[PDB]
Amino acid sequence: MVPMDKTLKEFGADVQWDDYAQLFTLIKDGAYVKVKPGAQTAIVNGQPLALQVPVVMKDNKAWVSDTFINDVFQSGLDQTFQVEKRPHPLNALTADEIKQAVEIVKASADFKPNTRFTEISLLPPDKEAVWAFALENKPVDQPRKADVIMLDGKHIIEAVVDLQNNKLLSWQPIKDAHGMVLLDDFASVQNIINNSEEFAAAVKKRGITDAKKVITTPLTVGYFDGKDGLKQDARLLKVISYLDVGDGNYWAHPIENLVAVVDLEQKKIVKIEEGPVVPVPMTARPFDGRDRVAPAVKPMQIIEPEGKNYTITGDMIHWRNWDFHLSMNSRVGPMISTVTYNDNGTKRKVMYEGSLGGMIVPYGDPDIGWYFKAYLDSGDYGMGTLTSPIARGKDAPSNAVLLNETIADYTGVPMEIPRAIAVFERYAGPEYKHQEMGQPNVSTERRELVVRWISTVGNYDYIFDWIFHENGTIGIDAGATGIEAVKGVKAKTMHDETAKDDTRYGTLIDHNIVGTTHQHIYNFRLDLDVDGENNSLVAMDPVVKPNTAGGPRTSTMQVNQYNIGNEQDAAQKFDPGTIRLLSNPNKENRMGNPVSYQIIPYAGGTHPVAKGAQFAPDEWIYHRLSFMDKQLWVTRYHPGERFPEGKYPNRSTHDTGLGQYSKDNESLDNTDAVVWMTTGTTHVARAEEWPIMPTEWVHTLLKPWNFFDETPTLGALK
Amino acid sequence: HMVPMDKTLKEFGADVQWDDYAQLFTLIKDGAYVKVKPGAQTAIVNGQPLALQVPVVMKDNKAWVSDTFINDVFQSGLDQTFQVEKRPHPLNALTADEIKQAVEIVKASADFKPNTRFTEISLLPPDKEAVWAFALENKPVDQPRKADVIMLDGKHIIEAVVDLQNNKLLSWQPIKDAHGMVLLDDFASVQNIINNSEEFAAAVKKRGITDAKKVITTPLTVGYFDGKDGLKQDARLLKVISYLDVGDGNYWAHPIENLVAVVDLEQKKIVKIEEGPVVPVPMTARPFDGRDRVAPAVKPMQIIEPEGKNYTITGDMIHWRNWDFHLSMNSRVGPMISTVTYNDNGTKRKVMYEGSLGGMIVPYGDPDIGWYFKAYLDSGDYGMGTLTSPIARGKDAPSNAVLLNETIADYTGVPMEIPRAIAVFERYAGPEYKHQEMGQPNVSTERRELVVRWISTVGNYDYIFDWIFHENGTIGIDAGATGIEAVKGVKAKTMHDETAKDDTRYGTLIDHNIVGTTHQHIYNFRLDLDVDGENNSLVAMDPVVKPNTAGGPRTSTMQVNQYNIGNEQDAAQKFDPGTIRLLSNPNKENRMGNPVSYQIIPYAGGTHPVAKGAQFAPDEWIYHRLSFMDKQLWVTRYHPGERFPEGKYPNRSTHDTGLGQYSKDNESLDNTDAVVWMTTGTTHVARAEEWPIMPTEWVHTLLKPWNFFDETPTLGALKK
Numbered sequence A: 001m002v003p004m005d006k007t008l009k010e011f012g013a014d015v016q017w018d019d020y021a022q023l024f025t026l027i028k029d030g031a032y033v034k035v036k037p038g039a040q041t042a043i044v045n046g047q048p049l050a051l052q053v054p055v056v057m058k059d060n061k062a063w064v065s066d067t068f069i070n071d072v073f074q075s076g077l078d079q080t081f082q083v084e085k086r087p088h089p090l091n092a093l094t095a096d097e098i099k100q101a102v103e104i105v106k107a108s109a110d111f112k113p114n115t116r117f118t119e120i121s122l123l124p125p126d127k128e129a130v131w132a133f134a135l136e137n138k139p140v141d142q143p144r145k146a147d148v149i150m151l152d153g154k155h156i157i158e159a160v161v162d163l164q165n166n167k168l169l170s171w172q173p174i175k176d177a178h179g180m181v182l183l184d185d186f187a188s189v190q191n192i193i194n195n196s197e198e199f200a201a202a203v204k205k206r207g208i209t210d211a212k213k214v215i216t217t218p219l220t221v222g223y224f225d226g227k228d229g230l231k232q233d234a235r236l237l238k239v240i241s242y243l244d245v246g247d248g249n250y251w252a253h254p255i256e257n258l259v260a261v262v263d264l265e266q267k268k269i270v271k272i273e274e275g276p277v278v279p280v281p282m283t284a285r286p287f288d289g290r291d292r293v294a295p296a297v298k299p300m301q302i303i304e305p306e307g308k309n310y311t312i313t314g315d316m317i318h319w320r321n322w323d324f325h326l327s328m329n330s331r332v333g334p335m336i337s338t339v340t341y342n343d344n345g346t347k348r349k350v351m352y353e354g355s356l357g358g359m360i361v362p363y364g365d366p367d368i369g370w371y372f373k374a375y376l377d378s379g380d381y382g383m384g385t386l387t388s389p390i391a392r393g394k395d396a397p398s399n400a401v402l403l404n405e406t407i408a409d410y411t412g413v414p415m416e417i418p419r420a421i422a423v424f425e426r427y428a429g430p431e432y433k434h435q436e437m438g439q440p441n442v443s444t445e446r447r448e449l450v451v452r453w454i455s456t457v458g459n460y461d462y463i464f465d466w467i468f469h470e471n472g473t474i475g476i477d478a479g480a481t482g483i484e485a486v487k488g489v490k491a492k493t494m495h496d497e498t499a500k501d502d503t504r505y506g507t508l509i510d511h512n513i514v515g516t517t518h519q520h521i522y523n524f525r526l527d528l529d530v531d532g533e534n535n536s537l538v539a540m541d542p543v544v545k546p547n548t549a550g551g552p553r554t555s556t557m558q559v560n561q562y563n564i565g566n567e568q569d570a571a572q573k574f575d576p577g578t579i580r581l582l583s584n585p586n587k588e589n590r591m592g593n594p595v596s597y598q599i600i601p602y603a604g605g606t607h608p609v610a611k612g613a614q615f616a617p618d619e620w621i622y623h624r625l626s627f628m629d630k631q632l633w634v635t636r637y638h639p640g641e642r643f644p645e646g647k648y649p650n651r652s653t654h655d656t657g658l659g660q661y662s663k664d665n666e667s668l669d670n671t672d673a674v675v676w677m678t679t680g681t682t683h684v685a686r687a688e689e690w691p692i693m694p695t696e697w698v699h700t701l702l703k704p705w706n707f708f709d710e711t712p713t714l715g716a717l718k
Numbered sequence B: 001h002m003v004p005m006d007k008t009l010k011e012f013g014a015d016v017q018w019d020d021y022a023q024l025f026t027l028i029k030d031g032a033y034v035k036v037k038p039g040a041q042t043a044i045v046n047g048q049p050l051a052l053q054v055p056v057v058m059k060d061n062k063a064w065v066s067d068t069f070i071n072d073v074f075q076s077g078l079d080q081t082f083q084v085e086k087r088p089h090p091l092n093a094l095t096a097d098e099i100k101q102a103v104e105i106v107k108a109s110a111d112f113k114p115n116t117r118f119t120e121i122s123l124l125p126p127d128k129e130a131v132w133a134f135a136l137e138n139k140p141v142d143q144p145r146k147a148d149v150i151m152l153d154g155k156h157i158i159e160a161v162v163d164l165q166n167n168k169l170l171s172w173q174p175i176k177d178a179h180g181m182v183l184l185d186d187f188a189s190v191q192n193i194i195n196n197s198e199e200f201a202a203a204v205k206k207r208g209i210t211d212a213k214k215v216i217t218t219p220l221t222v223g224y225f226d227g228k229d230g231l232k233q234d235a236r237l238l239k240v241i242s243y244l245d246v247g248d249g250n251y252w253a254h255p256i257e258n259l260v261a262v263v264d265l266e267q268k269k270i271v272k273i274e275e276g277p278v279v280p281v282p283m284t285a286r287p288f289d290g291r292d293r294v295a296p297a298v299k300p301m302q303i304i305e306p307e308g309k310n311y312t313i314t315g316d317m318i319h320w321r322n323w324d325f326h327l328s329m330n331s332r333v334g335p336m337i338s339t340v341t342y343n344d345n346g347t348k349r350k351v352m353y354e355g356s357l358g359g360m361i362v363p364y365g366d367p368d369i370g371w372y373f374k375a376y377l378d379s380g381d382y383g384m385g386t387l388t389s390p391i392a393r394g395k396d397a398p399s400n401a402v403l404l405n406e407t408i409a410d411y412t413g414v415p416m417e418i419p420r421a422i423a424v425f426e427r428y429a430g431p432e433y434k435h436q437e438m439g440q441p442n443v444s445t446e447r448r449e450l451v452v453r454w455i456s457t458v459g460n461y462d463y464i465f466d467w468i469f470h471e472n473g474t475i476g477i478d479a480g481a482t483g484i485e486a487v488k489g490v491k492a493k494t495m496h497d498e499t500a501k502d503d504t505r506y507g508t509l510i511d512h513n514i515v516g517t518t519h520q521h522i523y524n525f526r527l528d529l530d531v532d533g534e535n536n537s538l539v540a541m542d543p544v545v546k547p548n549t550a551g552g553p554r555t556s557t558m559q560v561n562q563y564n565i566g567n568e569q570d571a572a573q574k575f576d577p578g579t580i581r582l583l584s585n586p587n588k589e590n591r592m593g594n595p596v597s598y599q600i601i602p603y604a605g606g607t608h609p610v611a612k613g614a615q616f617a618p619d620e621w622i623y624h625r626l627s628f629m630d631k632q633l634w635v636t637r638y639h640p641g642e643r644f645p646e647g648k649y650p651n652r653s654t655h656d657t658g659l660g661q662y663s664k665d666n667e668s669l670d671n672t673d674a675v676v677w678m679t680t681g682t683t684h685v686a687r688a689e690e691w692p693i694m695p696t697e698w699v700h701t702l703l704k705p706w707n708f709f710d711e712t713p714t715l716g717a718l719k720k
């Protein structure tokens, strides 16, 4: 025997004891168990299970078999997870493949000693073959291959390896490309600053008595055509510092106007920029509750005693009429693939691949410590790598299923991220309703399947939800929380002398602290295949036109419809008052309308909206990142175009992302299109967001438009 | 004696769950979460033991309970959700008795008439200051309980005021040129007049209908057209749009297009019949109740609170965490949220004195005879409070909701109790905040929102309104729309038919011979916010990109243009979601010296395309009569008599007697009592996914505290 509570909690299961019913309720992900002390059977998701050894009470402490967890949880009565006998072609590289790929490039004579790995991912099989596997069970007759991007010092080398045949296919150095920031670069920066006599001197000057309490942050320096005095060939990082005061929150203690420039290869500071000295805000501002007592709250549980409505086979998720594949990438995180909607027996294509494209958090302060601050969290730091394990019951509801995902770290060693993604179903008000006067009411509840992922890069914590509605709609929400990057200022209140100058580029949220204004810009890459590969982009602008039919009305509500045939015209601002459809000119619904999906880049948000990039068109960040200034983009499908900010955005000199992908202005008529949605916010801070910011959300939507012939949720006809 | 447990508990409205393994019943009803085992001496109510007079008895697999079981258990007191109000709140809606008292008082007047109906019998609002003194200082309102009694004498409106405290009439004032709203009996009146109309039966017959008894009519207001509609302004009229009953339970899918009868109510006769081209009635059965559908298997999902709720309902007042507010029901606009305060570490701070739906409009864009006049002001012309749709437990609201009953007066002055009129429920809404510092213990707290939901159905539309109190001080207000669309009968079956192009010029072909005529949904909310006091000022904050003048590589910087909006005229405006608009209190600042304020966001998102304004040329009468349709933000000086965006008597109104009127004198909005009005709409272009029934579509608005607090509002009580 072994202690229950002790064993079960080590297993991660939740244990509830009801003294009135003499019943134990055990819960973990998809398993919902009920067992009574002394009973010869138990219940798993509503199904009876015979027990070898009943649960026994010993001194008011329950005890169970050392084989209990296995017999009960691995019984088979929990059908949430099913075995995958035939591995899906888009499955992420396994630990063995990650290690095989690293062995292949290490065997090459060109592999240098301290080489690191910026990314080790699956090389995308051809789209057609993948769809054939998902729709026809047809085997992908092409060897699994992996892209292996290496960083040798500061040099990028792209290699391709054949995993099935275990051989190196190509090794290509990438000229003038800088590598993203890697984990070890964080320590270097701190250690380099620590051993800097000059930096220590510069710090002493600014009031810091003990330099060993100085916390550094590794920041990309961008590109300024030399105006920032930085060598374009040197792998650099700028260091903004803070003072650790023991409140567990060094972000509340900026050392303003002090910027160090570090050369990662020479391993030393190559420039110290000093501005006006500003006393360091010292007041303790912890955010972890160490100085708080939470109010008592009555318990709330969301339960599915019979198990979940979804099934997870390997990485394939099935739920209602939806079927899709969920995989992980170290750079962009979750990838939703081969998405189909089972329309009354027939699976129709919706989206081949969808995922975060890229994002950026640029600032609007010109001072020495802020002008270069423009963060590309996924591109320059790797959001998948920095995935934050979900806090069960808090980051996601209590009826959620938490998945572990595996990627490779910067040294090429497999890394398993526990609770990397959350999958959960939720009530979302009534699906539809009609209370005809004096008649029996008609209502059905709405259910949404949410896939949630949280990544934390430095001070921002980002939340992404991929929401599947029963009626065919797909939502993509992005939430932002965490700690704001603040500027140290002399003003304590708005009544102080410097208050006006101190708050020119941001709100005074605390004494001597200003939350510098900035933007949050998310871009989503959506390779939609509306009921097929070949589609077209159609615009429908609701307009007011003069009445020509006669009668009292002087005007009417009509629609201005027209096709958008090329990439340049597809790159546009989005009017939430207009309609934009990706149609399939080859298929129609029962009424003769082209089956389509309505694209809505902006469906709402809790922070002010970013209409475009808050930068003059002559700013370098603006020139480098075109995707910031347009909410909608549509390009021709290409396997190597997956990032809005380009493949190598670190200190880039020009737009290699969506600016490059659409440069050509190719035809978008009846062909394989890829939609990119850009949605952002302009963040002007307030006191309510300090020391920690309450989650703010933005919403996007993809709605079926005449894709079906009627309300998709009425159900199948008898 | 005893009675069957299931049958009885269902009748009672409780969810009954039987667990065969545990030999345990789980009973849920509002704030009561009960557990009882057959043959047990006690039951459990919200985690507390209750001794039963008669234990549950199991007989031949059937449970039986005492005829007192329901009262003993559900009214035991172990469910503390509801508490008795010891001192009646001054804003409490009129009781059944008061309603009856007010009616007896006006019937005591020598002028009262037999056919006299009541459009609205509602509490006459005490002075704002006294009510606030009661809510904050607990000072008694020594002003007499009065009630407004708006009557309809034939077609004439009469406003009377009765003194309930002294049982006496205070005033009786006729209102000239004012038309009364549509009343319940007008519906029956119209259907009856059409049935007795020899001509209409003839008009219908020639349009392919054989049995005129299967014709369903609908009462629509005619609006105002300076006479172009050839309708006498003085008469009380209504236009009739007809449908054929095919037996599928959905007559809306069987329009009799191009046939409109004008009915004169007091005259009880059809005074005009407009006829257009004959169009075959779409006949195909299109039921929406599932009679012809297969019921897909779905596993159970329950949201439970086994120890009771975190909120308390004393009388009509709701207490939840830091929030305190009063909730009442009005027959015209529905739910009214009053005296809303937020407890800031012991001190109750004012937020909103009174908030509610202002009014709404759903105007169409088709010029033809059966549509050109169609523009519904559901609350104003129909009374949404009166047409409240009882909440369907577990479907219209989550299983962990508490359902409230509300009482109003019907058109004959008789007390009316609406069951499950409003739903109150707490809900998980993701993490309140979160920060995972690398290599450190994670920090997260869950977010909880208290939702107050009301649903009203007027004809074919079903509208849902949620008042969302976030624990961090934010207040959300969402509007959801669902129901059945008003379609136009056309000849085309597909877009390939010859008439398709012309048939779809004003709407999408969503079904064979059926077009979903384009239209808008324009909601307006009257929010009398008193940000930490009555005297406030409206402030604008426009984020802007300005040239860099501080040196360095940057050519531009992100700054803010801040200015005050000193008058009502300048406050009436379009809303750019890229800017910031605040209702500040120039007399109070937070710890950093900033004016305590609330950010007003009329547009925070939606699932349908957003209505940028009224889809009408500036020379249309509806546009003229109803100016609130074109601006998303309005701010006026507080006035107890100004409560509707469309005006107090919108039925056939000739000019704007609402927000156009309330702001016509362009008064000062500097450091005075302000009233915020948010207008938010959608332009609805139909699609097949919305027929035969439309999936709920939503629009979101938001009110966020801006420097109202000194730090993250949910950090918790300071330990030192």
Ligand SMILES: O=CCc1ccccc1
Pocket: A217, A218, A219, A375, A377, A381, A457, A458, A459, A460
């Ligand atoms: O998120 C922005 C860049 C960054 C990375 C790591 C620590 C602090 C800041």
Ligand SMILES: O=CCc1ccccc1
Pocket: B218, B219, B220, B376, B378, B458, B459, B460, B461
């Ligand atoms: O809801 C708007 C006007 C109406 C009322 C009753 C039936 C149909 C339409």
Ligand SMILES: [NH3+]CCc1ccccc1
Pocket: A096, A097, A100, A163, A164
């Ligand atoms: N060749 C696939 C990678 C691999 C390596 C070792 C064991 C299993 C799988």
Ligand SMILES: [Ca+2]
Pocket: A352, A527, A528, A529, A530, A533, A637, A672, A673, A674
């Ligand atoms: Ca595509």
Ligand SMILES: [Ca+2]
Pocket: A567, A635, A636, A638, A661, A662, A664, A666
């Ligand atoms: Ca291209």
Ligand SMILES: [Ca+2]
Pocket: B568, B636, B637, B662, B663, B664, B665, B666, B667
């Ligand atoms: Ca005024």
Ligand SMILES: [Ca+2]
Pocket: B353, B528, B529, B530, B531, B534, B638, B673, B674, B675
């Ligand atoms: Ca006010």
Ligand SMILES: [Cu+2]
Pocket: A480, A518, A519, A520, A683
């Ligand atoms: Cu921000």
Ligand SMILES: [Cu+2]
Pocket: B481, B519, B520, B521, B684
């Ligand atoms: Cu509509």
